[PDB]
Subunit: 238 residues, 4 copies
């Protein structure tokens, strides 16, 4: 049996147990600022990611076991003009050597808009801009190897409000669940779908966040993570 | 700082750390069977509750602190005729000396359909029967001092399937969140509302379950709890 | 699988999840004061106990499993005259309906100085007074069904200093381990013994503390518990 | 607040969340085999280490906080000739970029036998060979920036038996405690000392094990870790 766990109720400068990629910085208020801010205003065409440094053991070919996990986090998206919000934030699992891909609507996760099994990506996206592959309206999506979500639900961005997210995986039912709550308005969202992690992901992955601002100057927003917990449990064989 | 925590992944036949009230028994399969079953069939006019034996310290007048908590459980409701399902199941917090109240649509929680501040009850209900005070259709409700829910959402019963529930309280925002997921159908439900526990509940409470079958012979269903975890954390001041 | 857990980093007045027996009170400084204090001075012939309210499931006859547990606590003993210290403090496990027994050197645990299997008591004692059944000098003891310890080690009371205790049970090896550290002086003590909990204790027990001051006026000391954590884990059958 | 936690009840082949250094391999029985074994016999002049991949945040200059931690592990040392056992095993904390140093009695931890503040090492050693700087007999030591222990206690190797170790740090008292239990013989050991982590170690460290066999062919032994848990908690200020 193996478990991994971590908690950040806020973030420190130079977090050596996080791998920061692209534009990500830690703010003086202790937030993970994934996309760039300049003179209090979000900057366009910005992309940042942040991964926990240790690989997570998500399944084991030796014992044919698959891990459960649960992650919680708080985030804020602040768009000066909510009608022009872009592009969004995602929580993801990827190969250990994962590097940032294309900006904008591809969210730093994918190189193009196609499905490719060699991506080995599972993600939950909080998508603020309708691209050609998207459903109508802002939405939460479960993504497997593609920016084109397996499943989505409508989600209304509450501009500059704290969102509390929980994402969990139950290996026994192969179900990934994602919920988002805005305590300020008592509004809440949830979806779940079948995702077989053993078939999608390598045995070890890195986990974390990615976010991108829009590719035109008036389609901008901030993407800040305020807090993050993660717990995984790879059980003993049957 | 004070914390309380417990886990049951199944139940043992004479659970001395649970206070069983009314008809509740533990089955040979290790389930908490809240309402009576006879020869594999649910019995009408049955009421059962089950509380954790230890009081939970949910707020402290000495330090003006309020606890967070999170509880998870799995339950099954099996109605032979889904159109005649009644009456439902609830998770609740109540005074330490709480005793079962009226059966049927009052769910063992209340003596009538009014809103009495001296009840000191907070509950999340899974309501299978439309009473005169209910919204149309089966629903999940957040209840404060009344069977008339403060907030409800529609919920479609998946008959005889395992439902996974999480209920959490965030003291800082005074918000109670409840979610239900059916992994078998990939359906999920969530709601949240403002509930100020310090104003509603005494400093110590008991926590647990209640359920009731219908008050006519053809309006019956089982209410079984399969597993239950609970964690509370009363922080230090500031 | 079943687990039980709790933490107190200090104690609140009227702790409704503790069963206080005999003279025990909670002080305004947040200590569990097991033996009586009057005008800042310890009172003789005082006996107090404190138990966690919920029974702990320590073994299960249905699945033939036995729990592991670990408890930690901090305590202070203050004797105005260290040469006349009496009688000491113990951590114990006992039947759920346990009531205080004889004061003084029997520590509220036993009715007499004999071994009796029907006591169903396991205790770790911090013994400050040499009774006729004791080894020479102040000592820590592991007791099973008798005030006459199975195993003891010498322990020098550091008067009015905080002692940090850890007591753990490993079911797989049937070993009970007890350690005490005084961080102020970097002095530490440890002992362990084979104790088969399934043979000694009922399936459910209560856990807690007991302490007694001496039965003559000049043989007195305080016994305060400052903090307490407990965790038990009853595994699934293998 | 920041926490890090992990559990291994056994080790899998190719553990990508461990940094293996020198001779370390994972065996088919799931053990961390720190020093080399050839045809069932320990090899001399062997050195191996194993570190958890993620840096641990042990103190924070921004908030002036210092972490508590607790680690538990099980290990086995098997010496074909117990009188010629060498050299031993240590648990340690070191800078994130730590690399194996000299073999033999320096345990892979140090380049020489001197005290040097720039080592930034805290270790608990299980020392099976008397070097010129050692006390008489096999011993457990607390080491700070030197192979010459700050404090030691006698320890008798129980050859090829499982030792259960717990090492904990209490920031409030700046005390490190280490205990070792052999459940097979009901033998136990403990020591503690003042170690100020903020003054010794960098803000982030790696944690893990090191072990070395003797530098002559007849002074050999195996060093296997069977299981390992670690938990750290860096609190909020105040
Ligand atoms: C809004 O919620 C409020 C809080 O629940 C309600 O107030 C409570 O209502 C209780 C009844 O439902 C009531 O308790 C009863 O007290 C009776 C006698 O009290 C005196 O005498 C005692 C000795 O007998 C003495 O020690 C006391 O100090 C009192 O001076 C007692 O006879 C009742 O017991 C009989 O009936 C119950 C069934 O309800 C049986 O369980 C019992 O065997 C017996 O046959 C009853 O006692 C309670 O019995 C169960 C036991 O576990 C409890 O510990 C015991 O208290 C209670 O006093 C009040 N509480 C307060 C703070 O007022 C309120 O109800 C209405 O208003 C009250 C004032 C009263 O008029 C009720 O009849 C009303 O229904 C709720 N309001 C509304 C509109 O619903
Ligand atoms: C027209 C313009 O000003 N900017 C548009 C930009 O145009 C140019 C013009 C010249 C050159 N060039 O290399 O010379 C390159 C790009 O082409 C971008 C790629 O199609 C538009 O990107 C879209 O921007 C949107 C916000 O407006 C969202 O961020 C949306 O997700 C994003 N689309 C994707 C697929 O990421 C972007 O709006
Ligand atoms: C057979 C029948 O019709 N039984 C019905 C019963 O009727 C009578 C008729 C005359 C008298 N009287 O002596 O004045 C007493 C009872 O009145 C009960 C109170 O309204 C009905 O209770 C309801 O039963 C439903 C299922 O049928 C649900 O369980 C529902 O939640 C429950 N209602 C409540 C408020 O709990 C019950 O169905
Ligand atoms: C005033 C006095 O002499 N009291 C003494 C008392 O005496 C009597 C006198 C008459 C009768 N009787 O059966 O009538 C019974 C007892 O006999 C006790 C022995 O049974 C002394 O108890 C011991 O006191 C010591 C401190 O002085 C320690 O507290 C010690 O642990 C304690 N011993 C025990 C076993 O609890 C107790 O001091
Ligand atoms: C085969 C033999 O006798 N080798 C011995 C070796 O001898 C020589 C002699 C001359 C030269 N030279 O540079 O010419 C090189 C090696 O000197 C080593 C340094 O003192 C002995 O190392 C000690 O070996 C012991 C077990 O025998 C323990 O492992 C002990 O911890 C270890 N000492 C240290 C400080 O690591 C080592 O035993
Ligand atoms: C062993 O302990 C139990 C309770 O812990 C006592 O009740 C026993 O007392 C003896 O048995 C009881 C039932 C009663 O008959 C009494 O007179 C006996 O002394 C006790 N056994 C002994 C031998 O002291
Ligand atoms: C303490 O350890 C460091 C880290 O390897 C050594 O470099 C130090 O050596 C001293 O400083 C170096 C730069 C060099 O000047 C050398 O001559 C010094 O000895 C070491 N310090 C000591 C005193 O041994
Ligand atoms: C999928 O990804 C691989 C690796 O980047 C690439 O070489 C391949 O051509 C992609 N598309 C396929 C197989 O259709
Ligand atoms: Ca999009
Ligand atoms: Ca109803
Ligand atoms: Ca004594
Ligand atoms: Ca040595
Ligand atoms: Mn999308
Ligand atoms: Mn309802
Ligand atoms: Mn004694
Ligand atoms: Mn040494």
């Amino acid at each position: 049996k193996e478990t991994t766990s971590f908690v950040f109720t806020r973030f420190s400068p130079d977090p050596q147990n996080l791998l920061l990629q692209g534009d990500t910085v830690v703010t003086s208020s202790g937030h993970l600022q994934l996309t760039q801010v300049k003179d209090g205003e979000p900057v366009y065409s910005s992309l940042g990611r942040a991964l926990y440094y240790a690989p997570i053991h998500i399944w084991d070919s030796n014992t044919d076991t698959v891990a459960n996990f649960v992650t919680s986090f708080s985030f804020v998206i602040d768009a000066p003009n909510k009608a022009k919000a872009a592009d969004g934030l995602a929580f993801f699992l990827a190969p250990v050597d994962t590097e940032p891909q294309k900006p904008g609507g591809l969210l730093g996760l994918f190189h193009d808009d196609r499905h490719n099994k060699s991506n080995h990506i599972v993600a939950v996206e909080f998508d603020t801009f309708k691209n050609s592959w998207d459903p109508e309206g802002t939405h939460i999506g479960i993504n497997v190897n593609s920016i084109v979500s397996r499943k989505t639900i409508s989600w209304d961005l509450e501009n500059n409000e704290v969102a509390n997210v929980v994402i969990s995986y139950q290996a026994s039912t192969k179900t990934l669940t994602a919920s988002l709550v805005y305590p300020s308005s008592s509004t809440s969202y949830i979806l779940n779908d079948v995702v077989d992690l053993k078939q999608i992901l390598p045995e070890y992955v890195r986990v974390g966040f990615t976010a991108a601002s829009g590719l035109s100057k008036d389609h901008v927003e901030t993407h800040d993570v305020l807090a993050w917990t993660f717990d995984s449990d790879l059980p003993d064989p049957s």
